[PDB]
Scaffold this active site. Structure first.
Site, short mmCIF file in Angstrom:
data_model
loop_
_atom_site.label_atom_id
_atom_site.label_comp_id
_atom_site.label_asym_id
_atom_site.label_seq_id
_atom_site.Cartn_x
_atom_site.Cartn_y
_atom_site.Cartn_z
N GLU A 160 -28.76 59.63 -12.90
CA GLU A 160 -29.08 58.45 -13.69
C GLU A 160 -30.49 57.98 -13.33
O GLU A 160 -30.83 57.88 -12.15
CB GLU A 160 -28.07 57.32 -13.43
N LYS A 185 -33.42 54.91 -13.74
CA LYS A 185 -33.72 53.52 -14.07
C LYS A 185 -35.13 53.20 -13.60
O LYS A 185 -35.57 53.66 -12.54
CB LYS A 185 -32.73 52.55 -13.42
#
Length: 321
Positions: free
Chosen positions: A185, A187
């Site tokens: 992930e 970010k």
């Protein structure tokens, strides 16, 4: 120092929740903080009564209306989902006496024999605080899914590390060679208030990784569109405090089986040999159990106090059906 007053015990249990604004017109006019905090008092009290054998919430109407008004759509919606019923009269009746307002809450009758089928959780909750990772989405598990998870997770009992994270440094603007997926992930870093941003995202994403079969990795410092390694400039954070903050928020995550098998690594973002800032990677192994983003969002009256349910208690109660 609480927003609740407990007036009487079983079997005439009464919880005074102070002042609340009633009426759909009056509640739309309220500010967001006034509307939400009042709804919190109502939901937390109703959940406590449901799990504690019934009772009545006591409420001082904050609206100065000449005549009775409806409760309010947001309060209506909350008591409906909290009880998993399309009808409010299945568990709630209201009375108006003086400048007070009473909501009678029938006990959440889980240990009953019914033709209801569907799914009845043993206990009422606002949120299970249980998040799982599916593809690139992380989802909040509801009562139905969290029960089967908690039950099937350990009535019966694949992590591959990315070698990209073993380097001594990253170059600014370098493109991450692999895509966001079930195991990774990306970010970006907030422009301001770094550790406040990090501490807000760590519980949900990390908990979802640990609850899957293969775990995953969280990589902070990646541009969302160009997928280039940017990180946060070294002037905005101290990498020592960043590493500790991330490890701390992870250690605070409630666990029900043992800790989570994880590791946090700080990577220096270089620019032609000069330190620009830092990126951060958190690798978490699959956990044979359940990892929560918070405590389970539910309450119950214990002796003379409204106290929240411990994680071990909520889980034990949930799957004892």
């Amino acid at each position: 120092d609480s927003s609740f007053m407990l007036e009487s015990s079983y079997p005439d249990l009464v919880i005074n929740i102070g002042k609340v604004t009633l009426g759909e017109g009056n509640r739309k006019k309220l500010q967001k903080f006034q509307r939400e905090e009042e709804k919190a008092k109502v939901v937390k009290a109703a959940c406590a009564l449901l799990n504690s054998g019934g009772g009545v919430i006591q409420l001082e109407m904050a609206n100065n209306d000449k005549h009775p008004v409806e409760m309010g759509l947001d309060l209506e919606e909350s008591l409906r989902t909290l009880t998993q019923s399309l009808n409010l009269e299945a568990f709630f009746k209201t009375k108006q006496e003086g400048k007070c307002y009473y909501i009678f809450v029938k006990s959440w009758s889980s240990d009953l024999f019914t033709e209801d089928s569907s799914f009845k959780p043993r206990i009422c909750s606002l949120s299970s605080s249980l998040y799982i990772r599916s593809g690139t989405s992380v989802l909040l598990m509801n009562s139905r899914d969290a029960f089967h998870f908690l039950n099937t997770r350990k009535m019966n009992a694949l992590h591959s590390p990315y070698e990209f994270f073993q380097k001594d440094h990253l170059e600014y603007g370098e493109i991450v060679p692999f895509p966001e997926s079930q195991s990774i992930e990306f970010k970006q870093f907030s422009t301001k208030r770094i550790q406040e941003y990090v501490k807000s995202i760590i519980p949900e994403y990390i908990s979802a990784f640990a609850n899957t079969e293969e775990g995953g990795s969280l990589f902070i410092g990646v541009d969302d569109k160009s997928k280039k390694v940017l990180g946060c400039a070294k002037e905005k954070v101290d990498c020592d405090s960043l590493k500790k903050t991330i490890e701390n928020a992870i250690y605070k995550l409630p666990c029900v089986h043992c800790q989570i098998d994880f590791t946090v690594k700080i990577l220096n973002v270089l620019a032609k040999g000069e330190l620009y800032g830092y990126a951060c990677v958190i690798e978490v192994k699959p956990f044979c159990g359940a990892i929560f983003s918070e405590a389970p969002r539910s309450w119950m009256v214990k002796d003379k106090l409204i106290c929240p349910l411990a994680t071990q208690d909520w889980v034990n109660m949930m799957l004892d059906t």
